[PDB]
Amino acid sequence: VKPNYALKFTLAGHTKAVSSVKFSPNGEWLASSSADKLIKIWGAYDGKFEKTISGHKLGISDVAWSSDSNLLVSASDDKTLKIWDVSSGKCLKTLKGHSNYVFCCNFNPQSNLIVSGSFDESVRIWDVKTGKCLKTLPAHSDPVSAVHFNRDGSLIVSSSYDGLCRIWDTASGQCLKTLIDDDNPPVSFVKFSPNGKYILAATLDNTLKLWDYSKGKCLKTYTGHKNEKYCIFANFSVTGGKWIVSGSEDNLVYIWNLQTKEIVQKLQGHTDVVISTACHPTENIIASAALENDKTIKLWKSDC
Ligand SMILES: CN1CCN(c2ccc([N+](=O)[O-])cc2Nc2nccc3ccccc23)CC1
Numbered sequence: 001v002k003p004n005y006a007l008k009f010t011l012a013g014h015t016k017a018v019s020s021v022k023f024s025p026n027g028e029w030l031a032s033s034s035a036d037k038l039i040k041i042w043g044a045y046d047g048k049f050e051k052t053i054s055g056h057k058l059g060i061s062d063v064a065w066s067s068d069s070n071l072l073v074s075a076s077d078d079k080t081l082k083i084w085d086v087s088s089g090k091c092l093k094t095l096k097g098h099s100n101y102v103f104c105c106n107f108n109p110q111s112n113l114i115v116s117g118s119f120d121e122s123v124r125i126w127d128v129k130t131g132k133c134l135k136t137l138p139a140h141s142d143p144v145s146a147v148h149f150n151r152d153g154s155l156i157v158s159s160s161y162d163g164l165c166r167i168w169d170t171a172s173g174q175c176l177k178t179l180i181d182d183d184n185p186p187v188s189f190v191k192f193s194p195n196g197k198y199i200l201a202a203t204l205d206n207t208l209k210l211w212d213y214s215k216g217k218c219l220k221t222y223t224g225h226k227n228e229k230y231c232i233f234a235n236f237s238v239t240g241g242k243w244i245v246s247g248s249e250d251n252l253v254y255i256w257n258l259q260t261k262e263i264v265q266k267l268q269g270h271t272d273v274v275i276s277t278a279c280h281p282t283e284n285i286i287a288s289a290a291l292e293n294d295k296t297i298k299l300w301k302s303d304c
């Protein structure tokens with residue numbers, strides 16, 4: 001019926017705003033990125049600091065894991081993405097091509113491709129092995145806030161301040177669908193649902209929406225949080241009860257019932273905007289991260 005997330009660890013170390021936290025697919029690690037130009041690795045279960053990964057010349061907006069939990073990609077204000085070997089901390093490739101800040105990144109399930117989105121209004125598809133750009137998609141007419149592959153990597157979804165969500169065919173780069181609302185507020189986050197059927201989209205009018213993309217119909221709306229300024233990540237919680245999880249500009253983590261849309265928990269503790277949340281792949285564990293009045297990551301655990 002309702003979760004009971006309680007605070008287990010506060011992870012200190014970043015010296016500026018923390019922008020993104022991600023659990024490794026095998027559940028072992030949490031990776032964090034920050035405006036301090038650093039990536040940090042932490043134990044997912046004991047919160048123990050593991051290592052700092054350094055090399056970007058400016059701040060980092062996003063990080064993402066390969067499917068074997070061995071590689072990381074990061075997206076930076078220095079206009080590059082970097083591919084990292086987590087075990088060695090070494091930069092394997094620097095992905096060059098974007099003409100402005102890179103805001104978002106993800107591997108496909110095979111992890112032979114990386115997708116990125118940028119202030120430069122493009123979505124790029126990269127070959128992991130060579131580090132070369134395979135395709136540049138003229139995806140949007142304002143900064144791209146999020147990019148995500150579906151279950152098998154055959155589709156990409158992108159979101160933008162231009163107010164649009166777009167679905168792309170990975171192999172051809174052609175646009176398969178454009179989702180439009182009405183009053184087109186900036187779309188600040190998007191991701192495919194666990195079953196690949198739906199898309200979860202945030203707009204900067206304090207609203208999360210679950211869309212059936214093949215029918216182009218909104219199925220659920222989640223409200224009550226604050227989101228009018230920052231691109232705040234959202235998640236599906238798949239380990240216990242079926243929840244939607246998001247940060248909020250009132251410094252709280254919000255948790256909603258997937259089907260009824262009622263708020264079932266609000267997690268208090270952070271002292272700045274909670275810009276990023278992540279849900280552990282097997283354990284009812286949430287990671288949250290906040291902006292520069294806070295600079296910490298928090299790990300929470302629920303019985304359901
Ligand atoms: C995981 N997310 C984090 C937010 N990302 C993002 C998206 C659009 C814009 N944009 O359009 O400006 C900026 C950012 N980055 C940051 N936004 C706010 C505060 C930040 C603080 C430090 C580093 C990056 C920050 C996308 C991926």
Ligand SMILES: O=C(O)c1c(O)c(NS(=O)(=O)c2cc(Br)ccc2O)cc(C2CC2)c1F
Pocket residue numbers: 193194195196197198210219220236237238241242243244258259
């Ligand atoms: O009762 C359900 O199992 C169910 C459902 O599984 C999906 N699929 S999902 O991909 O959003 C999803 C979300 C989560 Br959290 C976990 C798994 C998952 O598969 C959607 C809906 C309603 C909202 C439309 C459901 F009621």
